[PDB]
Amino acid sequence: FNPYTEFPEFSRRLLKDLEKMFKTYDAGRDGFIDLMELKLMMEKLGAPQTHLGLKSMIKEVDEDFDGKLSFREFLLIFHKAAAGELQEDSGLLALAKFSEID
Ligand SMILES: [Ca+2]
Ligand SMILES: [Ca+2]
Ligand SMILES: [Zn+2]
C-alpha cells in the first residue's frame, strides 16, 4: 500500500495529520480502529453514533470485510469526503468535517 500513489490528491502534511489522527484513536495500538474505538472518536468529535450507525459507517469503507478500519480504509473515508462521495447525512461525513483536519 502506497498512500502517495493511492491518494495523490493528499498533501504530505494532510497524510501525516491523518496518520496522527488514526494513531490517536487506535487506543489498543493494533493498527486498526474497531467499533469501540470509533465509538469513542465520534463521541469526542461531537457526533455520537448509534451502534448500528457505527456498523454502517465502517461497512461503507470496509474493503477487506473485517469489521474494523485499517489505515488505508481510514484514508478512504477522507478521500470520499473530499471527492463529494459521502451522503450529506452520513456519519462518515460528520467524522471528516468534525476532525478539524485540513
Ligand atoms: Ca485498535
Ligand atoms: Ca477493514
Ligand atoms: Zn453489533
Numbering used by the authors: 79 to 180
Paper text:
In the case of EFhd1Ca, CaCl2 was added to the protein solution directly to a final concentration of 4 mM. We crystallized these proteins and determined the crystal structures of EFhd1Zn, EFhd2Zn and EFhd1Ca at resolutions of 1.72, 2.60 and 2.80 Å, respectively, using molecular replacement methods [Table 1, Fig. 1(a)]. Because Zn2+ and Ca2+ have different numbers of anomalous electrons at the wavelength the EFhd1 data were collected (Zn2+ f″ = 3.9 electrons, Ca2+ f″ = 0.9 electrons), the anomalous difference map should be weaker in the Ca2+-bound state than the Zn2+-bound state. In the case of EFhd1Ca, the peak heights in the anomalous difference map were 3.4 and 2.7σ for EF-hand 1 (EF1) and EF-hand 2 (EF2), respectively. EFhd1Zn had peak heights of 23.0 and 14.0σ in the anomalous difference maps for EF1 and EF2, respectively. This suggests the metal coordinated in EFhd1Ca was Ca2+ while that coordinated in EFhd1Zn was Zn2+ [Table 3, Figs. 1(c) and 1(f)]. With EFhd1, the peak height in the anomalous difference map for the metal coordinated at the crystal-packing interface was 23.0σ in the case of EFhd1Ca. Considering both the anomalous signals and the metal coordination geometry, we deemed the metal at the interface to be Zn2+. When we superimposed the EF-hands of EFhd1Ca and EFhd1Zn and those of EFhd2Ca and EFhd2Zn, they both superimposed well (RMSD for EF1 in EFhd1Ca and EFhd1Zn = 0.100 Å for 38 Cα atoms; RMSD for EF2 in EFhd1Ca and EFhd1Zn = 0.088 Å for 35 Cα atoms; RMSD for EF1 in EFhd2Ca and EFhd2Zn = 0.157 Å for 30 Cα atoms; and RMSD for EF2 in EFhd2Ca and EFhd2Zn = 0.253 Å for 36 Cα atoms). The side-chain topologies of the EF-hand loop were similar between EFhd1Zn and EFhd1Ca and between EFhd2Zn and EFhd2Ca. This suggests the metal coordination geometries of Ca2+ and Zn2+ are similar within EFhd proteins.
